[PDB]
Amino acid sequence: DICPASEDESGQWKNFRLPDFVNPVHYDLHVKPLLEEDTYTGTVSISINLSAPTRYLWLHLRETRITRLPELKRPSGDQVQVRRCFEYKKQEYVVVEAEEELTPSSGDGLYLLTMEFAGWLNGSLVGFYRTTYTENGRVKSIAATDHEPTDARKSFPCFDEPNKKATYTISITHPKEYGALSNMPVAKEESVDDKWTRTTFEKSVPMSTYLVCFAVHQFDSVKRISNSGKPLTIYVQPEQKHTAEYAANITKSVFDYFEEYFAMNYSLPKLDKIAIPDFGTGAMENWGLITYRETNLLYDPKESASSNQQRVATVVAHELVHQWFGNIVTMDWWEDLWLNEGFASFFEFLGVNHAETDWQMRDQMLLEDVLPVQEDDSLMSSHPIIVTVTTPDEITSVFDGISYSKGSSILRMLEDWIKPENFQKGCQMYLEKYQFKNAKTSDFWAALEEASRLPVKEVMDTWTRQMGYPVLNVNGVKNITQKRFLLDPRANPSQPPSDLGYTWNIPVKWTEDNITSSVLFNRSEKEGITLNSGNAFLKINPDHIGFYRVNYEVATWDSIATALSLNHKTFSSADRASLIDDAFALARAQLLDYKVALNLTKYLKREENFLPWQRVISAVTYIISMFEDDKELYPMIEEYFQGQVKPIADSLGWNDAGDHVTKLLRSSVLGFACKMGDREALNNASSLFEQWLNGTVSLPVNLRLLVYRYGMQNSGNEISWNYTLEQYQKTSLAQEKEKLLYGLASVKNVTLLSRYLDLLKDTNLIKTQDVFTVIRYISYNSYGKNMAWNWIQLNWDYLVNRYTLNNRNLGRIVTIAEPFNTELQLWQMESFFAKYPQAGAGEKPREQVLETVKNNIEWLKQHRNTIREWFFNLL
Ligand SMILES: *[C@@H]1O[C@H](CO)[C@@H](O[C@@H]2O[C@H](CO)[C@@H](O[C@@H]3O[C@H](CO)[C@@H](O)[C@H](O)[C@H]3NC(C)=O)[C@H](O)[C@H]2NC(C)=O)[C@H](O)[C@H]1NC(C)=O
Numbered sequence: 024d025i026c027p028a029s030e031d032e033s034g035q036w037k038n039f040r041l042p043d044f045v046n047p048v049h050y051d052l053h054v055k056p057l058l059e060e061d062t063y064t065g066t067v068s069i070s071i072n073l074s075a076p077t078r079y080l081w082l083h084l085r086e087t088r089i090t091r092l093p094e095l096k097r098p099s100g101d102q103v104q105v106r107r108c109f110e111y112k113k114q115e116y117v118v119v120e121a122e123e124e125l126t127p128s129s130g131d132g133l134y135l136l137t138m139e140f141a142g143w144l145n146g147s148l149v150g151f152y153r154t155t156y157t158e159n160g161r162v163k164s165i166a167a168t169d170h171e172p173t174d175a176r177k178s179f180p181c182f183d184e185p186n187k188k189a190t191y192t193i194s195i196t197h198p199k200e201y202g203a204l205s206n207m208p209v210a211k212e213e214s215v216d217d218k219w220t221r222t223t224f225e226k227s228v229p230m231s232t233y234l235v236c237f238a239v240h241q242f243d244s245v246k247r248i249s250n251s252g253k254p255l256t257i258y259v260q261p262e263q264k265h266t267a268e269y270a271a272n273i274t275k276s277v278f279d280y281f282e283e284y285f286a287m288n289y290s291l292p293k294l295d296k297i298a299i300p301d302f303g304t305g306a307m308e309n310w311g312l313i314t315y316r317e318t319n320l321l322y323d324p325k326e327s328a329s330s331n332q333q334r335v336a337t338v339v340a341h342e343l344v345h346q347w348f349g350n351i352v353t354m355d356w357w358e359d360l361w362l363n364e365g366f367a368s369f370f371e372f373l374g375v376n377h378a379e380t381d382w383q384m385r386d387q388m389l390l391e392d393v394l395p396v397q398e399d400d401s402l403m404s405s406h407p408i409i410v411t412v413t414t415p416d417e418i419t420s421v422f423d424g425i426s427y428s429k430g431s432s433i434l435r436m437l438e439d440w441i442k443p444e445n446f447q448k449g450c451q452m453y454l455e456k457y458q459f460k461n462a463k464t465s466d467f468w469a470a471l472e473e474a475s476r477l478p479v480k481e482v483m484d485t486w487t488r489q490m491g492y493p494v495l496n497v498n499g500v501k502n503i504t505q506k507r508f509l510l511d512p513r514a515n516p517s518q519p520p521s522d523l524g525y526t527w528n529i530p531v532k533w534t535e536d537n538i539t540s541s542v543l544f545n546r547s548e549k550e551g552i553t554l555n556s557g558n559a560f561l562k563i564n565p566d567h568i569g570f571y572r573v574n575y576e577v578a579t580w581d582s583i584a585t586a587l588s589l590n591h592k593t594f595s596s597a598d599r600a601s602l603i604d605d606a607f608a609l610a611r612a613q614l615l616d617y618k619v620a621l622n623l624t625k626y627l628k629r630e631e632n633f634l635p636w637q638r639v640i641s642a643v644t645y646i647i648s649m650f651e652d653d654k655e656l657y658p659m660i661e662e663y664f665q666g667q668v669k670p671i672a673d674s675l676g677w678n679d680a681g682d683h684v685t686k687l688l689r690s691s692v693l694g695f696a697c698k699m700g701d702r703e704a705l706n707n708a709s710s711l712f713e714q715w716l717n718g719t720v721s722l723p724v725n726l727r728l729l730v731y732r733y734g735m736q737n738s739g740n741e742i743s744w745n746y747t748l749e750q751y752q753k754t755s756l757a758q759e760k761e762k763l764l765y766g767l768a769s770v771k772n773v774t775l776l777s778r779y780l781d782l783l784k785d786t787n788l789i790k791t792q793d794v795f796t797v798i799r800y801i802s803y804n805s806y807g808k809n810m811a812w813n814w815i816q817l818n819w820d821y822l823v824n825r826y827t828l829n830n831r832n833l834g835r836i837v838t839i840a841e842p843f844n845t846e847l848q849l850w851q852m853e854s855f856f857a858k859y860p861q862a863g864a865g866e867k868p869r870e871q872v873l874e875t876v877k878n879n880i881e882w883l884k885q886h887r888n889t890i891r892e893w894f895f896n897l898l
Pocket residue numbers: 672673676703704706707710
């Protein structure tokens with residue numbers, strides 16, 4: 024109204040990107056929330072470096088409105104006359120036109136733009152918002168911000184691009200019963216009324232808008248002091264105070280580890296962590312004020328699982344990495360997002376490995392990132408690590424497996440190739456050089472190139488400027504050739520067009536009789552290379568350290584299966600997982616006969632290690648999933664795999680005994696036993712469930728989820744469903760709540776699942792942060808697979824209105840359709856997508872799930888008979 028929307032395109036504000044010649048230096052930001060009203064107001068004054076004649080100044084603003092007419096100051100100090108302001112919706116700009124036009128800022132002086140604005144605290148989990156929780160029967164409020172990637176512009180008007188780094192001095196006017204937090208320590212507090220306080224924080228270091236954070240809270244705190252002497256504190260609800268201890272421990276340990284590892288001081292005087300009761304992502308690395316979802320921060324050793332402990336430790340470590348990679352040095356543009364996310368996803372493992380010695384974290388990288396993303400990056404609808412992004416929806420979409428997991432994986436390969444010592448030093452030099460500035464990927468290669476003189480740019484470009492990865496084809500034990508690996512054999516291997524033409528410079532490592540050698544396999548060696556003792560067996564890609572698959576000759580694969588049956592310990596746990604993973608992905612891709620892959624599972628009655636069991640379970644889950652409705656194949660696949668896990672499931676038993684990894688193994692192994700229909704494992708689940716319903720018995724922590732799931736699935740009814748729903752409401756621990764939600768989604772009852780789906784619209788019952796989690800849980804239910812899919816279709820307009828098409832989790836919800844494997848189901852998907860063609864952040868997930876479902880249909884056609892034969896002839 025005061026800056027009305029205009030469809031005037033005839034200016035530079037038509038461009039998606041901000042102009043080069045306008046840079047901010049300093050933000051004077053003041054916000055005043057009316058908590059009980061779900062509104063806030065604010066004023067911002069921004070010091071501006073101008074480099075070119077312009078009659079217009081524009082910056083980002085979404086939803087939040089300008090309250091009066093903006094006012095501008097010349098570097099001399101005089102008031103610049105303003106003709107108009109207008110909003111340009113298409114590119115999320117507010118634009119002000121001078122009755123003038125003025126010249127650059129040539130010295131140390133700068134323009135100053137002052138704007139008044141008003142926004143909403145309700146209906147959203149981005150920008151600046153308020154949510155509630157209950158304490159001693161009273162409803163309490165907390166307000167906070169979440170900005171990454173393009174939501175700072177909702178909180179306040181700003182130059183909302185990662186390279187437009189400016190300095191910040193923030194102040195908030197809030198009721199006195201509340202404390203206020205931000206990036207920097209408190210500088211001064213002053214009484215406005217006898218009811219209100221104005222809290223001003225000290226000047227920030229130059230930082231990106233997406234990192235700017237503030238909160239208004241009545242939380243207690245658990246405190247720690249770094250080796251640096253700086254306070255590290257975790258803010259937490261008084262009720263939940265005891266559950267902040269572990270995170271406090273890890274924060275200290277990992278903070279102290281990283282500061283020494285990166286050879287650089289944490290830039291700020293303090294660091295705070297806080298979990299918002301309703302929070303839209305996992306966690307956010309806001310410099311000095313890291314916000315969390317409760318499940319990722321709050322841990323109770325008396326109620327939480329080892330899985331939960333590891334998750335907390337890992338996310339805390341992840342977030343801490345960002346204080347260096349992302350915060351100190353930021354990517355120049357979102358196309359280089361992996362410089363943030365891949366680095367955090369890599370170093371998170373080093374952090375927690377320091378904190379927790381017997382967690383085998385380094386190996387767990389294979390399970391967490393490497394192998395899962397090799398699935399993702401074998402689709403045509405993957406994308407290169409460096410990604411062209413032209414809209415806010417595209418930007419948010421690339422916060423994905425490629426950025427995180429493949430990012431993490433190619434750094435893991437890089438480190439090993441280049442040696443840890445040199446990788447470390449190179450990272451340090453990168454941090455020294457670009458501190459408080461922005462870097463491109465090119466900048467990082469050159470940094471490590473200074474630390475190795477190895478051809479980092481030449482080699483790593485191949486892993487980074489094109490999607491996908493190679494399979495190494497072994498000819499004669501010793502000759503290898505590279506070929507792009509795609510899950511779909513019908514797909515055109517040259518698409519989409521790549522300058523590098525889908526050949527890679529592959530750092531290749533192999534083990535000859537307990538001795539290790541290294542070669543760079545050059546792109547330009549079109550007809551392959553020969554691996555340099557007269558050997559009878561070459562173990563290529565030890566610990567799956569390189570981001571590629573190895574396809575041995577069938578004879579060799581056959582001999583591996585035999586070696587496993589005779590003495591599996593001949594191979595390391597990682598090597599076993601890796602051979603199993605490759606074989607099954609190769610069979611999936613029609614590059615290896617399924618009989619050969621399945622033959623590798625024969626030894627399993629003697630398998631006792633975590634890594635191979637995890638990758639076996641992953642591979643079987645897919646195959647079992649494809650044959651769910653096949654009355655012929657399914658019982659046979661079930662009977663066999665039931666027999667294979669029985670010994671290890673029996674050996675570990677239904678009790679929390681052993682070290683971290685053993686307990687993780689027991690969980691997944693007992694879960695798989697239950698999934699495969701082992702009557703005794705199911706009986707244990709039902710028995711413990713029945714006891715838990717008696718209201719006294721606290722279940723062994725690493726068995727709970729299984730007991731809620733299989734207990735509800737096998738003996739749940741309305742009475743126990745209602746009980747479980749009450750328990751979910753009554754527990755304060757978010758990690759327990761989440762397990763109970765999975766339990767509730769496990770009932771074999773259409774009426775009860777229907778009630779559950781209806782609860783998604785009730786914000787008193789299911790939190791906004793948890794809606795997509797619940798939909799996904801329901802989709803795993805044999806009835807709910809179709810119920811969840813049907814519900815998101817019927818309620819699509821409702822979800823879009825509630826979350827917006829810019830919401831990443833909403834974009835991704837269509838992946839509940841992954842198990843689909845008929846032409847009928849594919850037609851349903853396409854019909855639905857055609858009806859709602861505005862996909863937003865769901866554009867890529869749609870492409871991916873369509874490719875997956877098409878692969879599934881093909882897979883069934885190609886392999887049903889072969890797999891049937893293998894099982895029939897065996898049983
Ligand atoms: C939870 O799961 C346990 C399995 O992990 C069950 O324990 C098993 O119960 C079986 C049936 O009573 C026993 O079968 C016997 O196995 C021995 C092998 O050592 C054979 O001699 C017997 O032929 C066989 N049956 C007989 C004699 O009729 C298992 O031995 C037993 N123990 C283990 C460690 O596997 C629990 O029963 C189950 N709990 C609940 C509450 O259902």
